[PDB]
Design a protein around this ligand. Structure first.
Ligand SMILES: Cn1c(=O)ccn([C@@H]2O[C@H](COS(=O)(=O)NC(=O)[C@@H](N)CO)[C@@H](O)[C@H]2O)c1=O
Ligand SMILES: Cn1c(=O)ccn([C@@H]2O[C@H](COS(=O)(=O)NC(=O)[C@@H](N)CO)[C@@H](O)[C@H]2O)c1=O
Ligand SMILES: [Ca+2]
Ligand SMILES: [Ca+2]
Ligand SMILES: [Ca+2]
Ligand SMILES: [Ca+2]
Ligand SMILES: [Ca+2]
Ligand SMILES: [Ca+2]
Lengths: 424, 424
């Protein structure tokens, strides 16, 4: 959510910044609804005042009454109707305001799509192979460790069953990422719900615009009106909402959180084969709750935390600053890490690191204050993959493959694999 | 599913064994539907034969035809109607047969409920405290590590947010269990889908009788008729279904599988406070696919594997043989492990270990064969908690608490906690 006062005082300037994302704000419709809202607000608050007054006239008459009793019930009918009308108009203005993406930061290059994104840095040298490169799918079949057909039988398409040593390697990856961020990077570990409510989804921006990208659960019989849940598309959703309706002491900031969770999404034709696009995938998420003036330094730090995973694993990658047209809804500034994928002869996204500014903090009412201060202010929120675990397994398998199909275990993972050097 | 031939040849003996579970099989209704089914089966298969014959009369006439063309379309109408009627009757017989629980094994003591269960063994001596025992909820609040209120905000009741060192301890527990079973007990590790289809749920016995105990997901827009899924209530569901529609070589048995997953259930008034009853909980599951003659020896072995977790963690427990009236739907024989819970002054279930016999194997069409053999036979299936991770955390916190609220880390977990001796 954008600052309502910023929409009221600078709508054409807001519209101009949003135009860079390819988003067209309907200033006229929004203005026409807001002008009508002010008329109905006055009518309603006048009705509220007259009802409260005639109610008080009854209280002093019933102590010192049917003609006044009928008048208060007639006024009560009219006010309830007036409030219902105003609330429908408020919901309509809300539907527009909550579908507005975040204003891009001035650091963000202007562009229409992913082809306009700018490479910032590059690390490592993609390996030169002495044999024909096998993809992770072929390697998974050779070890009998990645079974797509069994997952179609159990569930359907875009699911996988991992078996044996490759399942153990996938686990070792998540353990290594969690230990790195909690031991070296200052993140606190968390176990979170994998099902969340509507308030949580509005808070981080999945609602109202991206309901179709979620798996929704039908309400429970014994919880009929309180269990309309959705599976989390990322640990960012429950972790960021931990500060919803909180006033944090500024001395307690930054709040750095990490979690390892399955991620459920329903986004065809693109990446039909393998682990790249899945309905369920594991991801080690990093979330930072910071002071408004520290968010840009925190973005650089958190991106470096995700880069450290790829460097210790010895996986060559490139760092890309996303353009205005390729950014996600909540982001004001994003860096993507793209890992070398040998069988695809290109770099593929493995992490997305964002500064959300006060966008989710406004929706959530997540505030901070210095003990002295007469008023609070909204915090800033940041989130980044450190990393997507299935895509790391793809990168690891393809980059560490041996001529016979054996997978060399990266040195940093060997302590997590009981010192094992090769799979197979 | 029970053997259909066993219901046809010994219905009163089947009914008598089921009576011990408190289940009343309607032999009369089942017999009346089956007698009618045989009448409709003859009528239909006669219509099939006459349609196939008159179709063949057209093929030889169109080479050597309207009076015969009208006759085949009239017969086609009648057969489609006859098949539709028969299929409705088959579905009705199926609804009864698929709601029949498993026949108890003769080893199982006869009883009505949990008060008729028999203690087999006991291990360890419950600790005597020099202070008032705090429950895990109070201990969680003291460390700031178990937050129920934040989970209500994120989702609703029967969810938890674990923060910091207690979240790390919960993870260390699951890592220790997985390593024990894969390194010492001969189980192969697996990554499974946490959403499953209707076939999978029928296969392990959740369907048709326990749909209300599940969280169901609404179908996806782009997968309208193939995505009616439910969240898994246990890793037993996807793991056991891995052998659905398979013919296994008997030399490849036993197939021993393990997985660590969240478990989603919707079962009020009982265990309102804490981690004992939750909508989401982690569990390390053990599944065995064995030869029919090895299932009873496998039950003893798998129960010992779950006991080994509690012994290495130094958690006193009791082993209980469940009576006929306290067994779960699929089980023919079950042992429950009940861990000492200091704040409750009793033993509480932490594991349920079952021999399912050929019940799920029949539903799934999971078979085995010796290379010589002219026919196959159904395998046996077994499943057991090694263990429920949230309930292990309860047991660990309460049994290892210090006077000031500090949690002593059990010796076997110290390598999984970087050598840390105490939380706090
Ligand atoms: C398997 N798979 C997918 O199917 C889709 C995405 N990803 C990876 O997830 C990373 C993070 O996704 S995101 O870009 O939408 N950003 C977030 O979720 C934020 N909370 C930051 O993590 C992508 O970069 C993909 O690599 C999959 O792995
Ligand atoms: C948190 N919580 C619950 O809310 C309910 C049960 N449990 C534990 O789960 C164990 C296994 O559940 S079961 O008895 O239904 N059996 C199975 O699911 C089989 N697949 C074997 O694991 C119980 O023994 C409870 O300890 C919870 O922890
Ligand atoms: Ca501080
Ligand atoms: Ca992106
Ligand atoms: Ca975001
Ligand atoms: Ca063998
Ligand atoms: Ca039980
Ligand atoms: Ca069972």
């Amino acid at each position: 959510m954008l600052d309502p006062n910023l929409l009221r005082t600078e709508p054409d300037a807001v519209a101009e910044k949003l135009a860079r994302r390819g988003f067209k704000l309907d200033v006229d419709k929004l203005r026409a609804l807001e002008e009508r809202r002010k008329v109905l607000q006055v009518q309603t608050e006048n009705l509220q005042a007259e009802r409260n007054s005639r109610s008080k006239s009854i209280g002093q008459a019933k102590a010192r009454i049917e003609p006044l009793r009928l008048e208060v019930n007639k006024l009560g009918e009219q006010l309830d109707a007036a409030k219902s009308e105003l609330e429908t108009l408020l919901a309509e203005i809300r539907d527009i305001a909550l579908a507005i993406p975040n204003i891009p930061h001035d650091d963000v290059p202007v562009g229409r799509d992913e082809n306009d994104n700018v490479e910032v840095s590059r690390w490592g040298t993609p390996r030169q192979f002495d044999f024909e490169v096998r993809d992770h799918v072929t390697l998974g079949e050779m070890h009998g460790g990645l079974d797509f057909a069994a997952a179609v039988k159990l569930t359907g398409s875009r699911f996988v069953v991992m078996k044996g040593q490759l399942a153990r390697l996938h686990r070792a990856l998540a353990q290594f990422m969690l230990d790195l961020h909690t031991e070296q990077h200052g993140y606190s570990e968390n176990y979170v719900p994998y099902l969340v409510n509507q308030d949580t989804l509005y808070g981080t921006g999945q609602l109202p615009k991206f309901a179709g990208d979620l798996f929704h659960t039908r309400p429970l019989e014994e919880e009929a009106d309180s269990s309309n849940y959705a599976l989390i598309p990322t640990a960012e959703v429950p972790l960021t909402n931990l500060v919803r309706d909180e006033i944090i002491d500024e001395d307690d900031l930054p709040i750095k959180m990490t979690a390892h969770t399955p991620c459920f999404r329903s986004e065809y034709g693109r990446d039909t084969r393998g682990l790249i696009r899945m309905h369920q995938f594991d991801k080690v998420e990093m979330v930072q709750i910071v002071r408004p003036e520290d968010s840009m330094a925190a973005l650089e730090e958190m991106t470096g935390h995700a880069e450290k995973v790829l460097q210790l694993l010895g996986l060559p990658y490139r760092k890309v600053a996303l353009c205005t047209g390729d950014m996600g809804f909540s982001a004001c500034k994003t860096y993507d890490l793209e890992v070398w994928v040998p069988a695809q002869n290109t770099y593929r996204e493995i992490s997305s690191c964002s500064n959300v500014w006060d966008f989710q903090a406004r929706r959530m009412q997540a505030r901070c204050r210095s003990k002295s201060d007469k008023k609070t202010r909204l915090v800033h929120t940041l989130n980044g993959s450190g990393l997507a675990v299935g895509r790391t397994l793809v990168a690891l398998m393809e980059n560490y493959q041996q001529a016979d199909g054996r997978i060399e275990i990266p040195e940093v993972l060997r302590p997590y694999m009981r010192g094992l050097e090769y799979i197979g």
